[PDB]
Design a protein around this nucleic acid. Structure first.
Ligand SMILES: [Zn+2]
Lengths: 133, 638
DNA sequence: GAATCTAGCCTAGCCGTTTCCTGATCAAATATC
DNA sequence: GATATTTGATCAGGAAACGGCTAGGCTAGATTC
C-alpha cells in the first residue's frame, strides 16, 4: 500500500516488465523538505567488483545514500524472486553508520533458492566500510 | 664392405645389395661437397642420381643459389631424379623471366612433385596458359603442375575450361580446384559427362558435385553415387546429404560399399545408431575404422571398460584404426606403470595422429617429470592436441633456453606449447621476443598472451608487420591491437580491421571503438563483413538502431545471430506476439541461434500445457544459456 | 620400363557453443573429540 | 558440551573447456601405355 518517508506517503509506482534485468526506483528527501526519485538498472560498471552486491539494484542505491550522505530512502524492484542471499549480508556493510533503508519486493515474490527472502526488510548500517579492490 | 666408410649395420641393411658398390664409388666426392651419411642413404632409391650430384653440383648451386642439401636430395630421390635436375639446369634460366617469374622454391616444388615431364610442359606452354582465353595466375599454374600426373591436367584444362565454363556454367576457380588434385584429368572428363545426369534425375546441386569430385580418387565416387544413391536412400533410409558427406573424402567408393554391406549388422548385433555409423564412415579411411570397430568393440568394452561412446569417439578422425589398435595394447601399461587415468588415455587418443602421441608420451614421461619439473597433468595437456609429438619434443629441447635466456616461467612455456601448432609458436617466440620487446615497446606478458592461442605464429608476424600503420594512420592504440590479435584467427581480424575501418566509420556512422569491439572475438572478420552487408537492410525494413545491431554482433558467433534474427523476426513478431526488443534481448547473450529456434519450437506447448506467459519464457531464455535451461529443468522436470 | 591413377595417415590454422571461477559476509551445521 | 569447520547464495562478465570443419604435404602399392 503505502510506506512512511518523513511526512510523505509513497505507494508502489509502475515498473517495466521483468525481462531478466532488474529495474528499480529510489525515493529520498532532499535538504529542503521535498521528495526526489531516481531510477536504477542492474549491471554496468562498478568501482567495487569484489563485492557481489555492488552491482545489484538494492546496493547501488545504498552507495548513493553514502556518496551524498543521505539518511532514509526507499527502493523498489520487479524481480519475482526477492533479494538474493548476498545482499542481506552486505547491504549493512556498504551502508554508512546509522543509515536506514527499506527494500520492498513486488507482491507475490516466491523465493526458490537458499538465502532468498520475499518480504520487506529494514537495513541499519554499521561502522565498517568496504575494502579497496 | 661398407663398415670401413662409417655406415652402421642398420644403415647397411637399408641399402640394396646391387647398389652397394655404387655407394662406395662416389662416397669421397659426395662427402667432400657437404653431404651427411643419412643424406647419402636417402639418395639411394634412385642409384643413377648418385652419379649426377657428385659430377655436377656447382652448376646446381649456380642455377639455384638458395637451394640446400635437403631439397636437392628430395628432388633426386624420386622416380625421375637425375633427369629432373638436368632439365632444371637448362630451363631455370628462361623460367625466371616473363610471363611467369618463378623463384627457387616453386621450381624445386614443381620438379620434385611433377618430374621432367611437368617441368618441360610448363616451359613449352608458358605463353598459351597465361594469355587469353585462359588468363591463369602463375600460382594457379604452379599448383596444377605440382602433382603426380602433370602434363595431362594442363592440356585437359586448356581443352575443357571454356566448354565447362560456358555450357554447364561454372566459376573459373572451380575448374582449377578440381584439376589441382591428383588425377584431375579423369575428374574433369567424368564431371563433364555426369553433371546433367546427377543434376536432373537425382536432384543434386552442382556445388555438391564439385565438392565430391575435388578429392584424390575421383571418377570413382561420382560413378558410385550414380548407382548406390537410390538403394541406400530407400532401403536403409539416409538423406542425400549424408551420402554426399560419405562420398566426399578420399576413397569414398570403399566407404559407400562398406556402409551398404555393414549397416544392418552393426545396427542390430552391436547396438549402434545409424548416425554414429555415418560419423565413423565420413572420414578418410572410413572402411578400416568400420571393420576395426566391428572386430574390437566386444573386447574393448568387456575387459578394459571403455563404454561404447568412447570407442566411437576414438574411431572417428583420420587413422582411427591405428588409434584403436594402439589403445588396445598400451592401455594396461600406461594405466599401471606411469599411473594414468583411463579417461586421460582416451582424451589423448581422440585426435589425429593419436598413435604417435601415445608412443611419445610413454617414451618421454619419465624424463619430463624427473628432469624438468613438470606434473603429469601438464604433459597430458600438451599431448592432447593435433601434433602433440612435435610439441613434446620441442618443449623438451627448448625449455631450459627459454627459461634462462629470456626469463620465462615454465607455466608460460606450458601454456604456449599447448593448442595446435605449439611447436611453431615456441620457435616464433624464441626468435621474435627480443625484436618486439625493444623496438615496438611491448611487454613480455603481452607477447606471451598473443602467442598462447591457435595460429600464434601468424598473429605475431602480422602484429610485427602491421603495428605502426594501424597505430599511426588510424589512431588506434597498441593495447587495442593486442586485444584484437589475442584471440584465434588474429591475422584475419587485423587485416579485415585495416581494410574495413574507414568504410564503416564514414559510410555507416560507427565509432572506432565499436569496430574494435566487434572484431575482438572468435571469428571477428565474419562478423565485420556480415555487419557491413546487413546493416542497411536491418535498419530500414525493420526498426532497429545501429546500437542494437552492434550489441547483437559483439559476441562469439554474431554472424549466425544476425542471419537468424533477419530470418526469424517477422514470424516470431507476428505469429507469437513478441516485441522486437525481446528478440534482440534473446539474441545478444551468447549463442543466439539455438536460443531463438528453441523458443520458436517450444513456445506453444510450454505456454499452453504448463501455463507460463510468454514473458516468463522470454526471461528464462534471455539471461544465461537458454537452450539447456528451456529443454531441461522446465520442459522436462515439469 | 616409364609414366600415371588411388587409398590411408599426419600437421597447422580457423569458426561456434557451453561450462567454470573470483572476491566477500553471516546463519546453520557435520565432524568432533 | 562445547566445539570447529564446511556449507550455498548473482539482478556479471572474462577466461577456459570441448566439440567440429578446410586446406595441404608425404608415402606405398596398383594399374595402364
Ligand atoms: Zn542482491
Amino acid at each position: 500500500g503505502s510506506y512512511a518517508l518523513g511526512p510523505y506517503q509513497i505507494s508502489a509506482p509502475q515498473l517495466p516488465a521483468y525481462n531478466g534485468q532488474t529495474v528499480g526506483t529510489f525515493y529520498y528527501v532532499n535538504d529542503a523538505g521535498g521528495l526526489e526519485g531516481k531510477v536504477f538498472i542492474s549491471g554496468g560498471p562498478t568501482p567495487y567488483p569484489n563485492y557481489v552486491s555492488a552491482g545489484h539494484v538494492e546496493s547501488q542505491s545504498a552507495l548513493f545514500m553514502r556518496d551524498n550522505g543521505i539518511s532514509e530512502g526507499l527502493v523498489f524492484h520487479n524481480n519475482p524472486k526477492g533479494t538474493c542471499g548476498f545482499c542481506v549480508n552486505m547491504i549493512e556493510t556498504l551502508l554508512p553508520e546509522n543509515a536506514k533503508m527499506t527494500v520492498v519486493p513486488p507482491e507475490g515474490v516466491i523465493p526458490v533458492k537458499r538465502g532468498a527472502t520475499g518480504e520487506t526488510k529494514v537495513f541499519i548500517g554499521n561502522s565498517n566500510g568496504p575494502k579497496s579492490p | 664392405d661398407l663398415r670401413t666408410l662409417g655406415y652402421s649395420q642398420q644403415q647397411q641393411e637399408k641399402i640394396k645389395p646391387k647398389v652397394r658398390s655404387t655407394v662406395a664409388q662416389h662416397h669421397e666426392a659426395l662427402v667432400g661437397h657437404g653431404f651427411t651419411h643419412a643424406h647419402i642413404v636417402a639418395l639411394s632409391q634412385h642409384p643413377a642420381a648418385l652419379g649426377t650430384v657428385a659430377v655436377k653440383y656447382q652448376d646446381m648451386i649456380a642455377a639455384l643459389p638458395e637451394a640446400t642439401h635437403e631439397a636437392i636430395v628430395g628432388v633426386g630421390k624420386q622416380w625421375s631424379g637425375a633427369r629432373a635436375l638436368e632439365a632444371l639446369l637448362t630451363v631455370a634460366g628462361e623460367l625466371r623471366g616473363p610471363p611467369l617469374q618463378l623463384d627457387t622454391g616453386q621450381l624445386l616444388k614443381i620438379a620434385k612433385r611433377g618430374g621432367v615431364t611437368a617441368v618441360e610442359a610448363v616451359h613449352a606452354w608458358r605463353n598459351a596458359l597465361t594469355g587469353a582465353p585462359l588468363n591463369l595466375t602463375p600460382e594457379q599454374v604452379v599448383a596444377i603442375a605440382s602433382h603426380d600426373g602433370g602434363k595431362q591436367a594442363l592440356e585437359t584444362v586448356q581443352r575443357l575450361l571454356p566448354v565447362l565454363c560456358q555450357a554447364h556454367g561454372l566459376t573459373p576457380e572451380q575448374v582449377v580446384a578440381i584439376a589441382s588434385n591428383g588425377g584431375g584429368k579423369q575428374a574433369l572428363e567424368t564431371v563433364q559427362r555426369l553433371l546433367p545426369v546427377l543434376c536432373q534425375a537425382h536432384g543434386l546441386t552442382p556445388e555438391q558435385v564439385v565438392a565430391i569430385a575435388s578429392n584424390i580418387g575421383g571418377k570413382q565416387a561420382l560413378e558410385t553415387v550414380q548407382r548406390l544413391l537410390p538403394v541406400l536412400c530407400q532401403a536403409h533410409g539416409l538423406t542425400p546429404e549424408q551420402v554426399v558427406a560419405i562420398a566426399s573424402n578420399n576413397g569414398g567408393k570403399q566407404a559407400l560399399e562398406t556402409v551398404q554391406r555393414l549397416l544392418p549388422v552393426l545396427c542390430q548385433a552391436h547396438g549402434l545408431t545409424p548416425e554414429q555409423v555415418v560419423a565413423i564412415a565420413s572420414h578418410d579411411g572410413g572402411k578400416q575404422a568400420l571393420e576395426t570397430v566391428q572386430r574390437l568393440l566386444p573386447v574393448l568394452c568387456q575387459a578394459h571398460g571403455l563404454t561404447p561412446e568412447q570407442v566411437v569417439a576414438i574411431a572417428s578422425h583420420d587413422g582411427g584404426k591405428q588409434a584403436l589398435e594402439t589403445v588396445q595394447r598400451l592401455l594396461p601399461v600406461l594405466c599401471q606403470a606411469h599411473g594414468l587415468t583411463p579417461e586421460q588415455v582416451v582424451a589423448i587418443a581422440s585426435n589425429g595422429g593419436g598413435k604417435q602421441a601415445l608412443e611419445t608420451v610413454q617414451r618421454l614421461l619419465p624424463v619430463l617429470c624427473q628432469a624438468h619439473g613438470l606434473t603429469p597433468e601438464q604433459v597430458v595437456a600438451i599431448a592432447s592436441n593435433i601434433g602433440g609429438k612435435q610439441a613434446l619434443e620441442t618443449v623438451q629441447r627448448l625449455l631450459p633456453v627459454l627459461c634462462q635466456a629470456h626469463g620465462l616461467t615454465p607455466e608460460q612455456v606450458v601454456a604456449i606449447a599447448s593448442n595446435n601448432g605449439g611447436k611453431q609458436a615456441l620457435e616464433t617466440v624464441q626468435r621474435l621476443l627480443p625484436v618486439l620487446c625493444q623496438a615496438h615497446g611491448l611487454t613480455p606478458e603481452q607477447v606471451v598472451a598473443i602467442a598462447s592461442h591457435d595460429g600464434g605464429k601468424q598473429a605475431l608476424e602480422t602484429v610485427q608487420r602491421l603495428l605502426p600503420v594501424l597505430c599511426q594512420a588510424h589512431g588506434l592504440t597498441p593495447e587495442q591491437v593486442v586485444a584484437i590479435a589475442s584471440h584465434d584467427g588474429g591475422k584475419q581480424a587485423l587485416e579485415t580491421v585495416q581494410r574495413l575501418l574507414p568504410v564503416l566509420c564514414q559510410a555507416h556512422g560507427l565509432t572506432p571503438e565499436q569496430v574494435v569491439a566487434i572484431a575482438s572475438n572468435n571469428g571477428g572478420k565474419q562478423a565485420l563483413e556480415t555487419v557491413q552487408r546487413l546493416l542497411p537492410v536491418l535498419c530500414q525494413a525493420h526498426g532497429l538502431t545501429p546500437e542494437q545491431v552492434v550489441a547483437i554482433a559483439s559476441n562469439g558467433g554474431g554472424k549466425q545471430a544476425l542471419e537468424t534474427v533477419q530470418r526469424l523476426l517477422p514470424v516470431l513478431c507476428q505469429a507469437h506476439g513478441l516485441t522486437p526488443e525481446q528478440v534482440v534481448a534473446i539474441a545478444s547473450n551468447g549463442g543466439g541461434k539455438q536460443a531463438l529456434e528453441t523458443v520458436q519450437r517450444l513456445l506453444p506447448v510450454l505456454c499452453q500445457a504448463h501455463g507460463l506467459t510468454p514473458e516468463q519464457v522470454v526471461a528464462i531464455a534471455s539471461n544465461g544459456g537458454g537452450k539447456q535451461a528451456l529443454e531441461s529443468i522446465v520442459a522436462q522436470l515439469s
